[PDB]
From a paper:
FimAECO, FimASHI, and FimASAL were produced as reduced, insoluble proteins in the E. coli cytoplasm without their N-terminal signal sequences. All proteins were refolded in the absence of the chaperone FimC under oxidizing conditions to allow the formation of the single, invariant structural disulfide bond. The purified proteins were crystallized, and their X-ray structures were determined at 1.5, 0.89, and 1.69 Å resolution, respectively. All FimA orthologues crystallized as self-complemented monomers, and all structures strongly resembled the previously reported NMR structure of the FimAECO monomer. Specifically, all three FimA monomers showed nearly identical immunoglobulin-like folds, completed by intramolecular donor strand insertion in a parallel orientation relative to the C-terminal F-strand. The global folds and registers of parallel donor strand insertion in the X-ray structures of FimASHI and FimASAL were the same as those observed in FimAECO, and all three structures showed high surface complementarity between donor strand and the rest of the folded FimA domain. The overall pairwise Cα RMSD values for the three X-ray structures were 0.30 Å for FimAECO/FimASHI (113 Cα atoms), 0.51 Å for FimAECO/FimASAL (154 Cα atoms), and 0.57 Å for FimASAL/FimASHI (110 Cα atoms), and the only minor conformational differences were restricted to loop segments 15–20, 37–45, and 89–97, and residues 51 and 81. Evaluation of the data according to the two-state model of folding revealed that all FimA orthologues proved to be only marginally stable, with free energies of folding at zero denaturant (ΔG0) of only −5.5, −8.9, and −7.2 kJ/mol for FimAECO, FimASHI, and FimASAL, respectively.
Numbering used by the authors: 3 to 162
Write the structure that this text describes.
């Protein structure tokens, strides 16, 4: 019955990475992130964006004698071969939106290539708790069409 909206479900992030420097918080290893609902009229041409929502990857127990910096990379399916930082939806079949994916922006506003090897801007660590912030947002690759939108990605943390 939806003829007018991309109707955001969740983007689901998983990232079980173990390192001596810090522990990934248990609330960060398997998280969702709701984007909600956008009229297709607002995503009518390639490059249009909407509905940026924040999420964080929290590191606990950091020890700066082990690492002074951290960064995160994300892995997922590109929506097409010429849009390497736009995550395909889990489905573009009947009932799901087409011509729209999801980008993961780091704390400097840069979209991250979804190759598991393109690291965010670094957090300069303090001992203890460190919160690395991101956003997710919709990104149109053409005239978006209506339907459900859900996506999935995994993440890794690199320390130095």
């Amino acid at each position: 019955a939806d003829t007018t909206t991309v109707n955001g479900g969740t983007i689901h992030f998983k990232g079980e990475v173990v390192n001596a420097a810090c522990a990934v918080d248990a609330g960060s290893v398997d998280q969702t992130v709701q984007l909600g609902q956008v009229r297709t009229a607002s995503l009518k041409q390639a490059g249009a964006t909407s509905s940026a929502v924040g999420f964080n990857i929290q590191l606990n127990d950091c020890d700066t004698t082990v690492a002074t910096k951290a960064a995160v990379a994300f892995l997922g399916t590109a929506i097409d071969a010429t849009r390497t930082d736009v995550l395909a939806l889990q489905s573009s079949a009947a009932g799901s939106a087409t011509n729209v994916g999801v980008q993961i922006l780091d704390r400097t506003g840069n979209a991250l290539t979804l190759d598991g090897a393109t690291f965010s801007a670094q957090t300069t660590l303090n001992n203890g708790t460190n919160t690395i912030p991101f956003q997710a947002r919709y990104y149109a690759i053409g005239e978006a069409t209506p339907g459900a939108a859900n996506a999935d990605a995994t993440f890794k943390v690199q320390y130095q």
